[PDB]
Ligand binder design. Structure first.
Ligand SMILES: Nc1nc(=O)n([C@H]2CS[C@@H](COP(=O)(O)OP(=O)(O)OP(=O)(O)O)O2)cc1F
Ligand SMILES: *P(=O)(O)OC[C@@H]1CC[C@H](n2ccc(N)nc2=O)O1
Ligand SMILES: [Mg+2]
Ligand SMILES: [Mg+2]
Lengths: 983, 363, 358
DNA sequence: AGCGATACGGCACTGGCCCTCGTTTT
DNA sequence: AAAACGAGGGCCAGTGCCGTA
């Protein structure tokens, strides 16, 4: 009730728009495809009083909202654009705090620069960071230069107090701060760390540059290479995200000079004061270039992204906030400890293996070793020079008692010793590495004159290329090797000859110990090359490999390590345990720098909501603080968030060490976070882009009917339906689907599905051939399918027809290509054109996949912006405290309070509903399906995570530490209206 | 189960043949050798460093072996509990705080009538009831970590969570011997019962300032058998397939290793400026590193003989002084972990040893 | 006197009210020791083992059982060292005369009913040929006397007495002046082979060791020192309106203590924790008085740190958080000095190393 | 026209510039 | 006695595989 899925709505009375012929074609298509076995399972309709609409449509609703939410900031930006610039001061003031430079650049001591808008670029001595040291900010009125307290030589103690720069004005509109990578500067603002607030928002010129004339990483790679027939036309219309480059692109003035010494990251605080004026000047150049770039970018951005939703969305997306406490420090210490322990064990075992294998140097018995014969095995003993002379060989030149009368013979032996000592020092010069030990052992050791010297062979690895060959047996064989690729593995007769000859002089290669090792292995070039495993003699070539890349080293083959082949020796279960150790510290190895250096400002009990103090938690001399995620507002593609740490933060896995990083963001007492994850966005997006193109309704496609049919709650989604084929649940099927939509390569889907399902290649290939029915079909000499009924003809002139191309049957890639064919904005819906470097006008463009992905992912990001502005609209209109936002592409979490969590979840549901209705309205009709209108899962708890129930590794016990629990949601939250008076 | 000959040949134990697993695990053994008591010495010192020194609020306690009121003490926990008040006075009633002591205990054993003594290192940790379990888990992880290092295979040492007959939580530590796991250290959380029984009169002298309030201290306790531990490291040090070539050597950690370096005389014979060996000797012992003197000798044999003799004694390095070194000043050196000849300078050798041990203590 | 009362309040001895007398201290009956006393004894035993490890050629450390092997507690520390003689003959390769040192807790009956007392003594059993036994006995006499003389504030306080009998041909006993009564501190006897020949008959062909192509059953030297009596000796030797114990720097339990001066601030605790770790990193015993919790006076604080025999007292004021300067204060001179916090470690280490002389 | 896509880092390995020292030169 | 050329090791940026969302 009715039309195969709709809810009670007041978003337009009319309406149909029937399309009888169109729906006849859709019905016939879905009959021959064919799907006509409806389950007839009506979802429980919801009757609630919707918030007041402003009219006429929801388009003008979101438009007016986004406009009134970004109006003061647009005003401030306009104040920056028409700003008449006063010249730089002749000298910079060396005083703490802010210094105003107005008429003729005089020095006027100021605590806080009171301006509507300004540019900003903060400096910070990395040598003892992460505390700000210098800052420069220009305004439409005059200049400002801020110095930190680092003007007096003391022995400071950095616990990250409220030392960051003060920028916000007190009450007892309003602010806008622009800058290149503005999030980094925001992180150094004094009043941005508070629980409440804030009025001040930020505008990033880097993100704006990315939105206007951005380029993909693949493009960046060959852009900087400038130092595929028409792939070099966009080279001068776009640039990399660097400040100098973006300035050379948008301003095109003289090349700004960068600091040649990199004193802020290479030097200490000492050499900074020696070059204070110069560094100040450089910072000024930076904020000035940033100013110009902004001035040139704002109108371009406003032109290319006309809808205000993107503007306000980008405004709220830049003011993220992560509250934390001492548990953060404890997490750091514990995780680092665990990591150091596991690494200690691993390196201990490996160096143990490396020590007992060094003994077979004497005498020349290493040549027999089928693993250790490639490396050095050197024996050095250098050096000395003659100075003593002459002509005499220096190479050969039981009595019981009780004497002690020679009391001072000890100091005689001592004197002789010291006198002998200080006469040999001038014989050598520079202490080289240990020559006695073989070369492979020298390389596997730290230098003697190294400040971080550890005894024995260090630098063991995991993932090196010497140690895996040092011990491991090789796939029912003996030797492993590397040249262009390591041991071949994972990611009508054929013959190949053989040969064996000697000529001298090369390294000796054994091949009998190999055969004998094979004999010992089966004690429990051809043949045995297909499925079994064996190594030849020399050659070296492929002669039976599946992967076209190689894998040094095998670090994700645990099921291929705990099933016999392959194994290690010596010996036992040391192999799979080593792989386990590698798997555990894999995350913390490539992230510990980002996590430990992740700064955090602790706010004192004087500058925090006293309503939290009233709440029965302090907690026991506990410190409460926070950290701003420091996120680039818009990075390719499309204008997604870009953050070094929190966007690549590992989930809750009982295997990984720092797997708790996500659940360490604990909300302050009295407060709680309420968030949600769209399930699913891009799939339903592609679905809509299909059905809206085919006809008017949402279920008039083969692909678009299955997306909005399944429920994740005690049911089966499309991803889950493909995961139960079987099939692998569930993320793998998601990768398979989303990988299929953006180019279902036959070998890619092959090795992928074969990697995830673990079976034989034939049946797998059958499954793929069954699943490749979706993309089929498609379009002198050519593919045997055209616009004509038959391809065979004689001298038939038809070059005017070979301009159409599109798939058939199930999928809807034709529309995704339709948006990828337009040489004009290509912006659905909304509705923002991107990159002068990917726009097919004056571009080959040969970047199709990136553009299909651009379409759907842009729909996803506009979905995100819509969610942001929608959530912001009813959070200020109603009494919902805590508006701070924390978004991760699909998911989005708001820092609310314990008494306004359910109404916030209700706000999330309303938001999702309105946004879905928006995507429905932008293509027609305004009507939308049932199992897609509202969220299915709403997380409401203290720390943020994936599922409501969370286990972990490092702290072992989650609730054992001071935590709580989560709550699934749901249908019980649909009883608390948006009005304050509930329950 | 064949390294016993190495323990007898090189005295880390008694030369008596009657040294069964039972006689060693019960503590009825005739005694340890000089290298064995030195190993145990360094092990106990390594305990004292990583338990008492670095961590504050932990003070040494001297408990008696007997009672004023014949059988001796079974555990040095009670004697430490008797020194609770006085040690509360020097800490100014600031708990959590602990008392550590390494003393020999006497255990009555019915051999299937005798009594076996064994050295134990115990730490009694007086901690508030609010944070008892937390300190239990803390000490569990840290003790287990302390034992899992110094080992060539840390996988052997394990832990076991167990409850009392009443419900008190506790943890045991095992080592995997060739015949199965064996208890080496035990940790328990006594619920202030014994302290309440010892002081029935005034319980006011038992209150400890938890912070903003004085509470009755929950008594945590960790007792570690250093004999079974010494034997555990002794087995762990000794080596196991397709190695193609085997050599007898026990790989003890350079920190707890009995003799650090071994000084000898090569080429041989050379008279009479060999008094430099004495210089290097006193110089070495002055820095607190163990050095074996190879002066008066009957061998006069293959170098492999005394090399294996030093490898059976887990000696880290073998420094060789010959006449060429008497000429220039570059003595020879043979590491145990990797048997390889290496030339080096004298004071450079001293500082290399000090740095070797110091860095071995680290990561 | 007024020394036994400052050993109770500063935790050198265990808590007692009746068994605190000198007669009960001289006896093995206890009320054992306090942390300061334990550390003092540990340092003393350490220096003992150091003053015999430098001795050529080689002396092997051993441990003897406490109870009777045949079913009881030990009186002397000789038998257990005689049991490991034949075994340690192999390690010395039967080459030269050699000894066995060991420090252990021996017992002795103290006299209602009679009880049992304990004492931690350090013994050395030096096996040496009969022709060169007396000379080596005089050698050990001199070396032990000098050993007690090094850490002594006064060499005249320690004395050496000679004696002999029918069982022991020649023996020497080391006394200590209190001066409430000279007491026994260490015994040096020259027992014959009778003690050793009694536990191995026979076939006594094992006992005789090589002495320059000569087989001879070695005479036994019995060194037996008391570390508790020595502890009390140095305690009375250090006691000097002032009440300060001036124990030897190499012997003193806690050699430095650092507090704060400025009001309770976290940064002060940070700096003091840093200095704490730095000082403990180079093996320097440091008393943490920065906990603290009040820091009342300074004179009674210095009095407390002088009654605990702390060499140097360190004060970390608020200026230290600017210049790094810190307030040192000696014990033997009580001179209020000031120096940078970075050069403190080197100063303490050099000062301790400067006390190494004989 | 043919295609996983958008990122974020990490460690292992390498050819090249630069400084130091010795073998070789008035 | 004095000028010159080659060998060795560190700092540098680039590249190939892998780590995560
Ligand atoms: N490899 C990979 N590539 C791509 O391109 N995506 C993107 C495709 S869409 C977007 C969100 O996906 P999701 O949130 O992880 O999943 P869901 O299907 O949106 O709904 P759920 O309920 O969570 O399953 O990420 C995601 C991938 F993982
Ligand atoms: P995480 O919780 O696994 O994922 C969070 C979001 C979903 C979309 C985005 N993402 C994840 C993985 C991949 N491969 N690509 C993405 O865009 O992160
Ligand atoms: Mg999703
Ligand atoms: Mg997602």
């Amino acid at each position: 009730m009715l039309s195969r899925g709709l809810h009670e709505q007041i978003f337009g009375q009319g309406g149909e728009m029937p399309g009888e012929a169109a729906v006849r074609r859709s019905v016939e298509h879905l009959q021959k495809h064919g799907l006509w076995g409806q389950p007839a399972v009506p979802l429980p309709d919801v009757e609630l009083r919707l918030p007041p609409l402003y009219g006429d449509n929801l388009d003008q609703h979101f438009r007016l909202l986004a406009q009134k939410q970004s109006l003061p900031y647009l005003e401030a930006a306009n104040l920056l654009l028409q700003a008449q610039l006063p010249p730089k001061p002749p000298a910079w003031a060396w005083a703490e705090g802010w210094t105003r430079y107005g008429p003729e650049g005089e020095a006027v001591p100021v605590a806080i620069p009171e301006e509507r808008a300004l540019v900003f670029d903060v400096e910070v001595c990395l040598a003892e960071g992460t505390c700000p040291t210098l800052a420069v900010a220009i305004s439409p009125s005059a200049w400002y230069s801020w110095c930190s307290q680092r003007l007096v030589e003391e022995r400071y103690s950095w616990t990250s107090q409220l030392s960051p720069a003060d920028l916000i004005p007190l009450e007892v509109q309003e602010q806008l701060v622009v800058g290149h990578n503005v999030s980094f500067d925001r992180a150094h603002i004094r009043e941005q760390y508070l629980i409440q607030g804030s009025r001040m928002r930020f505008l990033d010129t880097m993100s704006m540059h990315m939105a206007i004339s951005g380029l993909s990483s693949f493009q960046r790679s060959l852009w900087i290479a400038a130092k595929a027939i028409s792939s070099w036309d966009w080279l001068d219309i776009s640039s990399v995200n660097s400040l100098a480059e973006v300035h050379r692109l948008y301003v095109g003035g003289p090349p700004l000079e960068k600091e040649p010494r990199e004193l802020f990251v290479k030097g200490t605080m000492k050499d900074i004061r020696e070059n204070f004026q110069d560094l100040m000047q450089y910072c000024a150049q930076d904020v000035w270039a940033t100013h110009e770039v902004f001035q040139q970018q704002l109108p371009l951005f406003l032109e290319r992204c006309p809808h205000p939703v993107t503007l306000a969305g980008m405004l709220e997306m830049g003011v993220s906030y992560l509250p934390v406490n001492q548990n953060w420090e404890r997490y750091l210490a514990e995780a680092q400890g665990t990591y150091e322990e596991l690494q200690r064990e691993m390196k201990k075992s490996l160096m143990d293996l490396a020590n007992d294998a060094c003994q077979l140097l004497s005498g020349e018995r290493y040549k027999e070793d089928p693993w250790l014969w490639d490396l050095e095995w050197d024996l050095q003993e250098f050096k000395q020079k003659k100075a003593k002379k002459v002509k005499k060989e220096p190479a050969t030149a039981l009595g019981p008692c009780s004497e002690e009368e020679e009391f001072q013979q000890d100091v005689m032996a001592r004197a002789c010793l010291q006198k002998l000592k200080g006469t040999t020092e001038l014989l050598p010069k520079r202490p080289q590495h240990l020559p006695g030990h073989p070369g492979w052992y020298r390389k596997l050791c730290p230098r003697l004159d190294d400040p971080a010297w550890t005894p024995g062979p260090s630098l063991l690895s995991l993932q090196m290329r010497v140690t895996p060959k040092l011990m491991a047996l090789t796939w029912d064989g003996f030797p492993l090797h590397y040249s262009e690729r390591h041991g071949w593995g994972y990611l009508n007769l054929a013959k190949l000859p053989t040969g064996t000859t000697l000529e001298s002089a090369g390294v000796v290669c054994p091949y009998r110990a190999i055969e004998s090792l094979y004999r010992k292995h089966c004690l429990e070039p051809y043949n045995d090359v297909d499925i079994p495993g064996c190594w030849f003699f020399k050659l070296p070539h492929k002669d039976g490999n599946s992967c076209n890349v190689g894998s040094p080293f095998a670090k994700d083959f645990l099921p291929k390590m705990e099933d016999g082949t392959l194994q290690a020796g010596p010996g036992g279960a040391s192999g799979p345990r080593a792989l386990e150790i590698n798997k555990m510290i894999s995350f913390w190895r490539n992230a510990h720098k980002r996590i430990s250096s992740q700064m955090v400002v602790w706010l004192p009990r004087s500058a925090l909501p006293r309503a939290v103090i009233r709440h029965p938690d302090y907690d026991e001399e506990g410190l409460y603080g926070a950290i701003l995620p420091q996120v680039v507002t818009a990075g390719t593609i499309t204008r997604r968030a870009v953050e070094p740490t929190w966007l690549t933060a590992s989930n809750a896995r009982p295997d990984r060490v720092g797997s708790e990083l996500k659940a360490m963001v604990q909300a302050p007492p009295g407060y709680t976070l309420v968030g949600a994850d769209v399930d699913s966005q891009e799939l339903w997006i592609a679905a809509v882009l299909g059905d809206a193109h085919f006809a008017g309704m949402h279920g008039c496609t083969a692909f678009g009917w299955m997306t909005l049919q399944g429920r994740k709650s005690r049911g089966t989604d499309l991803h889950s339906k493909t995961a139960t084929t079987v099939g692998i649940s569930r993320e793998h099927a998601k990768i398979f689907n989303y990988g299929r939509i953006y180019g279902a390569g036959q070998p890619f889907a092959e090795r992928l599905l074969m990697q995830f399902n673990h079976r034989l290649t034939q049946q797998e290939a059958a499954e793929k051939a069954q699943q490749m029915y979706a993309a089929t079909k498609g379009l002198l000499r050519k593919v045997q399918r055209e616009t004509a009924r038959k391809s065979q003809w004689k001298k038939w002139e038809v070059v005017a027809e070979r301009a159409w191309k599109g798939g058939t049957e199930s999928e809807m890639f034709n529309k995704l290509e339709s948006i990828a064919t337009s040489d004009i904005p290509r912006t659905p819906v909304l509705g923002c054109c991107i990159s002068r470097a990917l726009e097919p006008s004056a571009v080959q463009e040969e970047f199709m996949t990136s553009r299909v992905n651009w379409v759907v992912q842009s729909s996803a990001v506009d979905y995100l912006h819509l969610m942001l502005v929608a959530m912001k609209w009813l959070f200020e209109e109603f009494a919902i405290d805590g508006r701070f936002c924390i978004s991760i592409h699909d998911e989005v979490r708001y820092l609310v309070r314990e008494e306004d969590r359910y109404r916030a979840a209700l706000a999330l549901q309303i938001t999702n509903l309105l946004t879905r209705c928006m995507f429905a309205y932008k293509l027609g009709l305004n009507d939308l399906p049932q199992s897609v209108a509202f969220f299915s899962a709403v997380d409401i708890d203290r720390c943020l995570r994936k599922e409501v129930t969370m286990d972990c590794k490092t702290p072992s016990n989650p609730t054992g530490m001071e935590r709580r629990y989560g709550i699934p949601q749901g249908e019980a939250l649909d009883i608390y209206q948006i009005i304050e008076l509930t329950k | 189960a064949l390294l016993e000959i190495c323990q007898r040949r090189h005295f880390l134990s008694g030369s008596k043949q009657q040294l069964s697993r039972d006689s060693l695990l019960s503590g009825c053994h005739p005694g340890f050798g000089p290298l064995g008591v030195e190993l145990r010495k360094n092990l106990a010192a390594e305990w004292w460093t990583s338990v008492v020194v670095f961590r504050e609020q932990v003070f040494p306690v001297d408990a008696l072996h007997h009672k004023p009121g014949r059988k001796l003490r079974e555990n040095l926990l009670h004697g430490a509990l008797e020194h609770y008040v006085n040690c509360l006075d020097l800490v100014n009633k600031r708990l959590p705080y602990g008392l550590a002591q390494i003393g020999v205990c006497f255990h009555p054993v019915f051999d299937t009538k005798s009594i076996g003594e064994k050295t134990e290192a115990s730490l009694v940790w007086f901690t508030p009831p609010r944070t008892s379990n937390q300190w239990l888990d803390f000490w569990l992880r840290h003790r287990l970590q302390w034992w899992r290092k110094f080992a060539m295979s840390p996988s052997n040492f394990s832990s076991s969570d167990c409850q009392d007959e009443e419900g008190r939580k506790g943890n045991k530590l095992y080592y995997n011997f060739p015949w199965g796991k064996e208890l080496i250290e035990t940790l328990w959380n006594l619920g202030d019962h014994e302290l309440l029984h010892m002081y029935p009169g005034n319980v006011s002298k038992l209150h400890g300032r938890d912070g903003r309030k004085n509470v009755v201290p929950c008594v945590l306790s960790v007792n570690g058998d250093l004999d079974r531990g010494m034997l555990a490291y002794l087995y762990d040090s000794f080596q196991t397939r397709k190695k193609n070539l085997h050599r007898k050597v026990l790989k003890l950690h350079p920190c707890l290793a009995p003799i650090k370096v071994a000084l000898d005389v090569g080429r041989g014979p050379t008279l009479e400026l060999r008094q430099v060996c004495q210089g290097l000797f006193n110089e070495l012992l002055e820095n607190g590193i163990s050095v074996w003197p190879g002066y008066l000798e009957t061998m006069q044999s293959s170098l492999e003989q005394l090399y294996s003799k030093y490898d059976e004694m887990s000696i880290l390095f073998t420094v060789l002084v010959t006449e060429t070194t008497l000429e220039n000043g570059l003595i020879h050196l043979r590491s145990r972990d990797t048997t390889m000849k290496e030339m080096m300078h004298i004071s450079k050798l001293k500082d290399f040893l000090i740095k070797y041990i110091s860095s071995a203590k680290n990561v």
